A paper describes a structure:
ALK2 is a type I receptor that binds two different ligand classes of the BMP/TGF-β superfamily: the BMPs and the Activins. With BMP ligands, ALK2 signals to play roles in bone modeling, while with activins, ALK2 regulates signaling by forming nonsignaling complexes. The overall complex assembly of ligand:receptors is consistent with previous BMP complex structures, with the type II receptor binding at the convex, “knuckle” of the β-ribbons and the type I receptor binding at the interface built from the concave fold of the fingers and the wrist helix.
The cryoEM structure of ALK2-ActRIIB:BMP6 was resolved to 3.2Å, and the map was well defined for residues: ALK2 (31 to 109), ActRIIB (26 to 118), and the mature BMP6 ligand (410 to 513; 82.3% of mature domain). Further comparison of ALK2 and ALK3 reveals that the alpha helix that is formed in the ALK2 β4β5 loop is uniquely extended an additional half turn when compared to that of ALK3, as well as other BMP type I receptors, ALK6 or ALK1. However, the additional helical turn in the β4β5 loop of ALK2 positions the C alpha carbon of Tyr74 3.8 Å closer to the ligand fingertip than the corresponding Tyr103 residue in ALK3. No molecular contacts are seen between carbohydrate chain of BMP6 and ALK2, suggesting that there is no direct contribution of the carbohydrate chain to ALK2 binding. We do observe, however, several interactions between the carbohydrate chain and specific residues in the same monomer chain of BMP6. Specifically, the primary carbohydrate moiety forms a stabilizing hydrophobic interaction with His452, as well as forming a hydrogen bond with Lys482. In contrast, ALK2, with a glycine in this position, is unable to form the salt bridge with BMP6 and is thus reliant on the presence of the glycosylation to stabilize the prehelical loop’s conformation for binding.
Residue numbers in the entry:
A (entry chain F), F (entry chain A): 26 to 118
B (entry chain B), D (entry chain E): 410 to 513
C (entry chain C), E (entry chain D): 31 to 109
The structure:
């Protein structure tokens, strides 16, 4: 089992939870991960979506959460670990 | 020439889903290919109808075509995409990857 | 029950060991060739229906119920 | 040239199951045939993977073959057959007939 | 919601009336021809993914959300 | 719903019911029928298996139960009706 911090920016319109930590779910023999997605905004960091992510090949054994994509409209980093979506950096690959 | 699970990596840059999908940039579909011939071993996960069909094909070749190598076990993948209102939404698309191909 | 038999042939998961309710050996005429198959059936209904067909031109499904019963029971076409 | 449910009547006299099956002497298998091309309408009951596969086939024809027209809804039929000990047994064979063919 | 649109094309169950969440009109280049298709999508996930692809050579999936929205929105290939 | 008389000759070995009337079962939009199977035995009629039968094309609208098969090892007649497997005749087609 695993668990990631679930913050959703659209809490109002979808009448969903804004803050909290949510347990992850998945099928047998299926790794679960944490995902974070935010907007840098030339320094003014604005968190967008954070939560659980299903099995992904490119998101494997990521003890930290690093957004390797260079100059993206929405930065996105996937990590494998318990509550690994609380720290994130943009390190271009 | 056998129902197998050929592995491949499909990227969303090639399909044109480049400016409305944030992650993943690509995943593994693992398509299925091959042929089913009478009789079928337990490895080729086949239904009773598949067996009847391959038998009626062996008896008469132009009557019925061979069974088709189709996926049987599928999983789901999470997609974080933009909608039509510039918002971003996470959705679990079901039946996106293949983990077993049988003579369904 | 379960019975371990060889799994030689074009289609197998790279494991000759095949654990099944009914093992067999088949020799067809599909695509104008003499392809040989040897395997196991972990489905009683399917094993029975496929082992009750009468050998004829095109099929030679000789089955077997015992331990390693498949090794030396090679299939042979009829007249 | 479309995933359809072609109807046919298969008889057990032709398959050689003549001296160990008492009833039925034959039934209707209703095999499936056709081709699946991008995109697929709601009539062709297809999974998400089928759609991804036909799209990657449209982008590159030799990369991936088209999806396969496979049965999706199946029913069961009762068979009253002789066993190896001259007894007679009734059994509900499952997945013997086809009532819907989709691009599975 | 549900929307009734025409279902002309090589593949349909002999009913032009097609009730779907997203109707569309497509024009491909499959098997070197200009096959035209018009139909409906009763699956939101599939309708979206197939209506968000960017028109290019080989595909022309122009969709529509309204009532009988498909009749006069014939697809056209790009440059 | 439907119901047929269930008499099974193998009640001993399968430890199943010998006599009784059993409700039929089936899926939606699937007709159910009654089936009877017996051995004539040159006059000494011996009931064998009687019970429920799934959807069958050749067993359609059979208000009675007639075994049309000529000279069979085990006579078999399928009928469509409520408790239609109590009377059976061998009328060759
Ligand atoms: C949001 O974007 C800003 C601007 O691109 C990011 O700041 C950048 O962080 C990188 C980290 O590698 C800095 O590069 C390094 O900086 C210093 C010298 O300035 C030195 O350690 C290295 O030689 C290397 O060049 C980069 O300078 C810096 N840019 C600016 C304008 O400050 C920031 O990390 C992004 N934050 C998030 C949360 O995405
Ligand atoms: C018919 O269905 C069965 C059951 O789903 C499929 O068997 C599965 O085959 C795959 C591929 O060989 C197995 O995965 C492999 O398992 C081991 C352990 O990790 C290793 O050899 C490989 O790393 C790989 O993961 C899988 O375990 C196996 N499943 C079971 C339950 O035995 C079979 O492939 C299907 N038939 C066809 C023709 O695809
Ligand atoms: C995809 O799946 C759907 C749903 O199972 C299939 O629709 C089914 O199509 C059949 C054949 O047209 C319909 O049967 C017909 O229904 C009426 C009423 O009896 C009549 O026209 C015929 O006598 C026949 O029985 C069936 O009702 C219909 N099911 C539903 C729920 O709408 C569809 O065929 C599948 N796609 C393909 C390509 O096979
Ligand atoms: C068990 O087998 C016996 C013997 O085959 C069946 O009796 C036969 O019943 C048929 C009914 O069509 C009789 O044919 C008719 O008989 C009389 C003249 O004998 C007349 O009504 C018609 O001209 C016609 O020929 C047949 O004679 C009779 N055979 C004998 C030897 O009595 C019997 O019905 C079978 N019972 C069951 C439960 O299967
Ligand atoms: C979601 O909100 C409900 C209702 O207030 C609360 O009971 C629950 O603990 C919340 N969950 C998380 C993960 O914050
Ligand atoms: C089957 O036998 C059980 C146990 O005696 C009895 O309760 C039940 O009513 C019987 N059913 C029929 C159809 O005879």
């Amino acid at each position: 089992t695993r668990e990631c911090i679930y913050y959703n920016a659209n809490w109002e319109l979808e009448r969903t939870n804004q803050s909290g930590l949510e347990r992850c779910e998945g099928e047998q023999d299926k790794r679960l991960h944490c995902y974070a997605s935010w907007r840098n905004s030339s320094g003014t960091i604005e968190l967008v979506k954070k939560g659980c992510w299903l099995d992904d090949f490119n998101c494997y054994d990521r003890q930290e959460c690093v957004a390797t994509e260079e100059n993206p409209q929405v930065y996105f980093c996937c990590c494998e670990g318990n509550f690994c979506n609380e720290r994130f950096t943009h390190l271009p690959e | 020439t056998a129902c197998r699970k050929h592995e491949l990596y499909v990227s969303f840059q090639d399909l044109g889903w480049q400016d409305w999908i944030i992650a993943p940039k690509g995943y593994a579909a693992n398509y299925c290919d091959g042929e089913c011939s009478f009789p079928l071993n337990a490895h080729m996960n086949a239904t009773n109808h598949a067996i009847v069909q391959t038998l009626v094909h062996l008896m008469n070749p132009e009557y019925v075509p061979k069974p088709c190598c189709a996926p049987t076990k599928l999983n789901a993948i999470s997609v974080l995409y933009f909608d039509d209102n510039s918002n971003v939404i996470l959705k679990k698309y079901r039946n996106m990857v293949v983990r077993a191909c049988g003579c369904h | 029950k379960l019975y371990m038999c060889v799994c030689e042939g074009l289609s197998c998961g790279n494991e000759d060991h095949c654990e099944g309710q009914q093992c067999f050996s088949s020799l067809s005429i599909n695509d104008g060739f003499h392809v040989y198959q040897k395997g196991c059936f972990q489905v009683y209904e399917q094993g029975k229906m496929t082992c009750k067909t009468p050998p004829s031109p095109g099929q030679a499904v000789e089955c077997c119920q015992g331990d390693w019963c498949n090794r030396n029971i090679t299939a042979q076409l009829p007249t």
